[PDB]
Amino acid sequence: KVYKVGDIVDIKANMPHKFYQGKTGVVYNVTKSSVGVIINKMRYLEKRLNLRVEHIKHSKCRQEFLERVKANAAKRAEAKAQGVAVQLKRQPAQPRESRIVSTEGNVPQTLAPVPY
């Protein structure tokens, strides 16, 4: 593995004097036996928190941002290829449209708790 200053990381133990498991942080220092990680906590304080390399993993939360940015650039190029609004913006989930379910192959069986 490899690490560098300023990389995002999420604490993850492989009870251990503390319960910092799962807290996200960014690297601030590196050493052969450990890798430093800042951990903001509540006013917010600059509580640096070193951790063993075994109990760490690179965060993936920021990968979605770069992926959406590249997809937005590709959609903008595609919109330039034609005449249309790029419409690349994310949207909240929306209510399902009405649809006519058919009872032909699906008769509504009653259950009426047996209770069984």
């Binding site: 604490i11 133990a13 009870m15 251990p16 004097h17 503390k18 910092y20 050493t31 036996s33 450990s34 509580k47 640096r48 928190l49 070193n50 951790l51 063993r52 075994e54 109990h55």
Partner: protein, 88 residues
């Protein structure tokens, strides 16, 4: 052989006689670990004092190296006091 009469106070027993300090209980190395279901001996086995190096985070150069340096400093100070008592 001549009797082993070369006893020495080692500069500590005199201070103990000068004060209220008393000999250690000598009851046992074992002592209960904090926030744990099993006793962790402080000497003669896996030690809680060395557990600090094994913890996944110190919340603060590596601090574990500083702790090992402090332990080596205490050991060298004990060896120096032993050699100084050897000198007399």
């Amino acid at each position: 052989k001549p009797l082993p009469k070369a006893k020495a106070m080692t500069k500590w027993e005199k201070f103990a006689a000068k004060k209220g300090i008393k000999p250690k209980e000598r009851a046992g190395k074992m002592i209960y670990d904090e926030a744990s279901g099993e006793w962790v001996p402080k000497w003669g086995y896996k030690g809680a004092n060395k557990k600090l190096d094994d913890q996944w985070l110190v919340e603060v150069i590596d601090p574990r190296t500083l702790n090992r340096a402090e332990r080596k400093r205490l050991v060298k100070k004990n060896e120096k006091q032993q050699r100084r008592n050897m000198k007399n």
